[PDB]
Design a protein around this ligand. Sequence first.
Ligand SMILES: [Cl-]
Ligand SMILES: [Cl-]
Ligand SMILES: [Cl-]
Ligand SMILES: [Cl-]
Ligand SMILES: [Cl-]
Ligand SMILES: [Cl-]
Ligand SMILES: [Cl-]
Length: 289
Amino acid sequence: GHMASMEMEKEFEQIDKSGSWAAIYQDIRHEASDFPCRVAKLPKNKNRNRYRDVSPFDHSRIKLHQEDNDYINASLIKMEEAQRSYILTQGPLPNTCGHFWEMVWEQKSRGVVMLNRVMEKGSLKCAQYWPQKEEKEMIFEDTNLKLTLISEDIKSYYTVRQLELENLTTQETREILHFHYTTWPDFGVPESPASFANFLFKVRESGSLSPEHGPVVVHCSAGIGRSGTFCLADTCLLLMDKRKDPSSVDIKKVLLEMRKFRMGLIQTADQLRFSYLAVIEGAKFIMGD
Ligand SMILES: [Cl-]
Ligand SMILES: [Cl-]
Ligand SMILES: [Cl-]
Ligand SMILES: [Cl-]
Ligand SMILES: [Cl-]
Ligand SMILES: [Cl-]
Ligand SMILES: [Cl-]
């Protein structure tokens, strides 16, 4: 509400004017939790990790319902006070797309949030894990899942797709919404915080963040930088509406809470700054400003 917005904008101005983003961001890095990632580092899981230096903590990792190997590079971020949960995961690999959709099915997720393009900077950031044409569905034979593109709505800053995910073992089918933010720049942060806040509102409006469903699945390439920005802004905005007096929300403390559940969330000072901007813009929109 009004008081939380005022204090947020105030704290932003003070950091910005004093050139403090890099120092604040270094502090967060220094203070952040360290927990073991023993399962991620097992030799049999080397081909399930996109990056050697980005791993889920054992305590918060998502387990596939698999006797063979339950490992996927994905973490449950559980925000107690805000009453929101998110699964943050790396962009699927060629050999982990079946695992990805198994996780979506097992966790009962309604939405998938993608914040990168399959190719960026001339390199593959993520496998093509969803079908691009209605008439060419995908079958994941290892996990017995079928995935059909039903429709897509292409907007200037993002695309929304309706997907149909079918468990071939049981023939149950589910509608999954794919919220694809397609315009994050190859370097730096988006020029429009408002486009990103608007994107977050479209995800919220679909019910994908709601407790009736399993946690939304959020990914970029490593699942920590852009993905961290998305969930940090969402949680901060919720808290700004939930809290009484003082109504103020401390973004650094919220980010440190989130980093208890996955390492490295928010990978640059510029992403920290962008996070504040998206929250500020989002709150103005909510208040009808
Ligand atoms: Cl092993
Ligand atoms: Cl919280
Ligand atoms: Cl893409
Ligand atoms: Cl950046
Ligand atoms: Cl990325
Ligand atoms: Cl706080
Ligand atoms: Cl870091």
